Amino acid sequence: VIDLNASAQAMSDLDEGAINEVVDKVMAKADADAAQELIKAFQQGMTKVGERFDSGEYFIGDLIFAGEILQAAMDKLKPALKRAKIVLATVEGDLHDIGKNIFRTMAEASGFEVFDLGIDVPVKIIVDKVKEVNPEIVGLSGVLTLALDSMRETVDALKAEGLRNDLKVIIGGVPVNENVCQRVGADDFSTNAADGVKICQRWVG
């Protein structure tokens, strides 16, 4: 670009004018390597959206916005240019998916292939999907205590099938924290969907 750090800031600020000004400049010079640098800068800015949510400056709506804004930039940058895979579910006992879907949108916009299994998803169905597609990451959503139990059951089933050690497990949902992460047997838990993407990007290469 002219200025990658300013472009990261523009994503952080959710400034559609500035984001599209730079996307246009990059698309004009038709350099794949420059487009990839801009993408990385936008991804860094997504992380900053999460930090701004965690501070209380930004709200749920801003997280919805961020995902949609990143995806729109990615769609424009695609002409100028093997995805890591995530199997994603709201687990058995739970019908809450607003949050999971915020994450799904951010993860899709960040170049992951996401297999969204939907809500109230039985353990056995999650495990069958992991056998089928061999994802790098399994992401599990829930809030009710029964759901948190189903998270633990899903990890235990992956261990029984010899699948656990070759993937990473991330959990999210209203009540998740380090204590729930430990009880479940997950690798990490998210504070917010943008933090979760940050985690997942670190795991993949």
Residue numbers in the entry: 1 to 81, 88 to 211
From the primary publication:
O-Demethylases belong to the class of cobalamin-dependent methyltransferases that catalyse methyl-group transfer from a methyl donor to a methyl acceptor via a methyl­cobalamin or methylcobamide acting as a reaction intermediate. Bioinformatic studies propose that CobDH is part of a multi-component O-demethylase enzyme system.
CobDH was crystallized in the presence of methylcobalamin and the structure was refined to 1.5 Å resolution. Two CobDH monomers were found in the asymmetric unit. The overall high-resolution structure of CobDH reveals two domains that are separated by a flexible linker. The N-terminal domain (residues 1–82) folds into an antiparallel four-helix bundle. The C-terminal domain (residues 90–212) resembles a typical Rossmann fold with a central five-stranded parallel β-sheet surrounded by six α-helices that forms the binding site for the methylcobalamin. The corrin ring and the central Co atom are presented on the surface of the protein, while the dimethylbenzimidazole (DMB) base protrudes deep into the central β-sheet region. His102 forms a coordination bond towards the Co atom from the lower axial site, which results in a base-off/His-on cobalamin-binding form. No electron density has been observed at the upper axial ligand site from the Co atom. This finding leads to the conclusion that the methyl group in the crystals has been cleaved off by photoreduction during crystallization, cryoprotection or X-ray exposure, a process that has also been described for other crystal structures of methylcobalamin-dependent enzymes, resulting in the formation of cob(II)alamin.
